[PDB]
Design an enzyme around this catalytic site. Structure first.
Site, short mmCIF file in Angstrom:
data_model
loop_
_atom_site.label_atom_id
_atom_site.label_comp_id
_atom_site.label_asym_id
_atom_site.label_seq_id
_atom_site.Cartn_x
_atom_site.Cartn_y
_atom_site.Cartn_z
N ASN A 134 0.84 -1.15 0.00
CA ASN A 134 0.00 0.00 0.00
C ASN A 134 0.91 1.24 0.00
O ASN A 134 1.44 1.61 1.07
CB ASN A 134 -0.92 0.04 1.22
CG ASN A 134 -1.80 1.23 1.22
OD1 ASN A 134 -1.81 2.03 0.27
ND2 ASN A 134 -2.60 1.43 2.28
N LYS A 143 0.15 4.20 -0.28
CA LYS A 143 -0.55 5.36 0.27
C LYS A 143 -0.34 6.53 -0.67
O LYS A 143 -0.27 6.37 -1.89
CB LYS A 143 -0.21 5.58 1.73
CG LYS A 143 -0.46 4.34 2.57
CD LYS A 143 -0.31 4.55 4.04
CE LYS A 143 -0.46 3.22 4.78
NZ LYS A 143 -0.36 3.38 6.24
N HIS A 174 -9.54 0.82 4.68
CA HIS A 174 -8.30 1.13 5.39
C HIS A 174 -8.57 2.17 6.48
O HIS A 174 -9.44 3.03 6.33
CB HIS A 174 -7.27 1.61 4.35
CG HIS A 174 -5.87 1.60 4.85
ND1 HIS A 174 -5.35 2.62 5.55
CD2 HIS A 174 -4.91 0.67 4.77
CE1 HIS A 174 -4.11 2.34 5.88
NE2 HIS A 174 -3.79 1.16 5.43
N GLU A 198 -7.47 5.04 7.99
CA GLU A 198 -7.72 6.50 8.00
C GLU A 198 -8.93 6.82 7.14
O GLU A 198 -9.64 7.81 7.41
CB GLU A 198 -6.50 7.28 7.56
CG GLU A 198 -6.10 7.25 6.12
CD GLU A 198 -5.60 5.93 5.55
OE1 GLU A 198 -6.50 5.03 5.49
OE2 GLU A 198 -4.45 5.80 5.11
N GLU A 220 -5.24 -5.18 10.76
CA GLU A 220 -4.28 -4.10 10.91
C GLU A 220 -4.65 -3.32 12.16
O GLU A 220 -5.46 -2.41 12.05
CB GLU A 220 -4.37 -3.26 9.62
CG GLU A 220 -3.38 -2.15 9.61
CD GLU A 220 -3.06 -1.74 8.17
OE1 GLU A 220 -3.91 -1.31 7.42
OE2 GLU A 220 -1.85 -1.96 7.86
N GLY A 222 2.09 2.68 10.91
CA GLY A 222 3.01 3.80 10.75
C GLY A 222 3.68 4.23 12.05
O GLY A 222 4.41 5.23 12.04
N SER A 264 3.35 -1.84 10.62
CA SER A 264 4.78 -1.84 10.93
C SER A 264 5.48 -3.14 10.58
O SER A 264 6.52 -3.46 11.14
CB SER A 264 5.02 -1.42 12.41
OG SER A 264 4.46 -0.15 12.66
C1 LIG Z 1 -1.49 -1.62 6.52
C2 LIG Z 1 -0.70 -0.32 6.44
O1 LIG Z 1 -1.48 0.78 6.73
C3 LIG Z 1 0.43 -0.36 7.48
O2 LIG Z 1 1.33 0.76 7.23
P1 LIG Z 1 2.80 0.59 7.86
O3 LIG Z 1 3.52 1.89 7.41
O4 LIG Z 1 3.33 -0.67 7.22
O5 LIG Z 1 2.71 0.48 9.36
#
Ligand SMILES: *C[C@@H](O)COP(=O)(O)O
Ligand SMILES: *C[C@@H](O)COP(=O)(O)O
Lengths: 249, 249
Positions: free
Chosen positions: A10, A12, A94, A96, A166, A172, A212
């Protein structure tokens, strides 16, 4: 006897065309020698670039979100539009988007249902907050989120679903769930699916962990019997995603 | 002495690659012989296709929305990402984003400010609801929306702003504002800008009308002295957008 694992990136809201070209070359040059579905989810505007450059046969391209129908929805991208451009994977629910952008369980469930009807593979995200964890509500929360989704699906539709557990507190933050924490939740999710959906469905269902994940912690997570791979945020922007993929061997 | 007009196509959440290729060819084959900035705002996933195919020199490409910063915002597209891919126009504050997707005046104003700082041309949307119209609150509403935006802008930033007055009751409903209704609002907006921002800024500012514009009603709208062009939804998906452009002659 685990089902086929998934290693999903992902990205983002990140990337330039130069950075994407470099990272896709890294992904392309990494020969994968086991059965795994790799997924990369770029921003919408980067989908064509990734489609043009990504060639590793273990990969598919996913959207990070969608709405169900085309029409008067300025700024949004619909499921039919994605299908037409060749994208048939989507991440839905997801955290957020749930937190920031008003996606309730009902909205997520409706999106997942529509996506399945339109032939998508769906990575449906669930997970508890730190507050819910400390209140001993983890199970209740993830089962409520899952059952909301389930309420809008037929049994056959589950063949298109992937769950991503998650915990919100792991996203993050540099605070990964332990293998035992993740396994506990995946086990209880799978049992719920077995009893409420079907034993066949449960055996085949991929339940991914996210929050993470990095190249150093992934193999120990993957060793747990009910963990089928990963949804990866920050580490998926880096070459070490290669080792996260290989941690699903 | 009007400033340069704008004819802007908000395609909303619509298109296939086949339909887009056909419509872009229509746009390309339409020779425009007056000074007008044409804008097409495709969905994010269609931006690369439009960039590849659109060649009419009177056009630029716009996003339909954005967020200000890159980062952990699954599903969203940021202003830096757009700039990197060559998109430096954005529509902000369109009504269903305000209505459906929680964009308050403060959120719109912040987005507009960030976009201006990053060098975008911004089409900032304002407009009253049917309820507000019938309560005789049109002026109060559009001035409040405008002043919220203004509060986060420097004077120089206004050179990058375009206002789009779009009564909510005219969007997609087949109930266009009359030329007199639109002119009344554009006049009061321009006077507000003149007095609160600057007389120079007001003279140069494009204030576009949107809401059920079509090729048959556009020229009569454009004849009004404070109307500088159009933000077009449904009719911009059709070949008759050519005549909407030419209605700004
Ligand atoms: C699933 C995803 O939001 C996790 O983000 P990380 O930066 O891998 O914690
Ligand atoms: C400004 C835009 O939303 C208006 O859409 P129409 O379909 O042109 O009414």
């Amino acid at each position: 006897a685990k089902p086929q694992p998934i290693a999903a990136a992902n990205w983002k809201c990140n990337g330039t065309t130069a950075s994407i070209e470099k990272l896709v070359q890294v992904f392309n040059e990494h020969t994968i020698s086991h059965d795994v579905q790799c997924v990369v989810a770029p921003t919408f505007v980067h989908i064509p670039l990734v489609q043009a450059k990504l060639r590793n046969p273990k990969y598919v391209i996913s959207a990070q979100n969608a709405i169900a129908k085309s029409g008067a929805f300025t700024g949004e991208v619909s499921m039919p539009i994605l299908k037409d451009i060749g994208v048939h994977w989507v991440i839905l629910g997801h955290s957020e988007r749930r937190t920031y952008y008003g996606e309730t369980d009902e909205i997520v469930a409706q999106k997942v249902s529509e996506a399945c009807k339109q032939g998508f593979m769906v990575i449906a995200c669930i997970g508890e907050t730190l507050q819910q964890r400390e209140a001993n509500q983890t199970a209740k929360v993830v089962l409520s989120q899952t059952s909301a989704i389930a309420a809008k699906l037929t049994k056959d539709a589950w063949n298109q679903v992937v769950l991503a557990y998650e915990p919100v507190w792991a996203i993050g933050t540099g605070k990964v769930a332990t293998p035992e924490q993740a396994q506990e939740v995946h086990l209880l999710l799978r049992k719920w699916v077995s009893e409420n959906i079907g034993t066949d469905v449960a055996a085949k269902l991929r339940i991914l962990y996210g929050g993470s994940v990095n190249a150093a912690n992934a193999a120990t997570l993957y060793a747990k019997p009910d963990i089928n791979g990963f949804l990866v945020g920050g580490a998926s922007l880096k070459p070490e995603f290669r080792d996260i993929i290989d941690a699903t061997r």
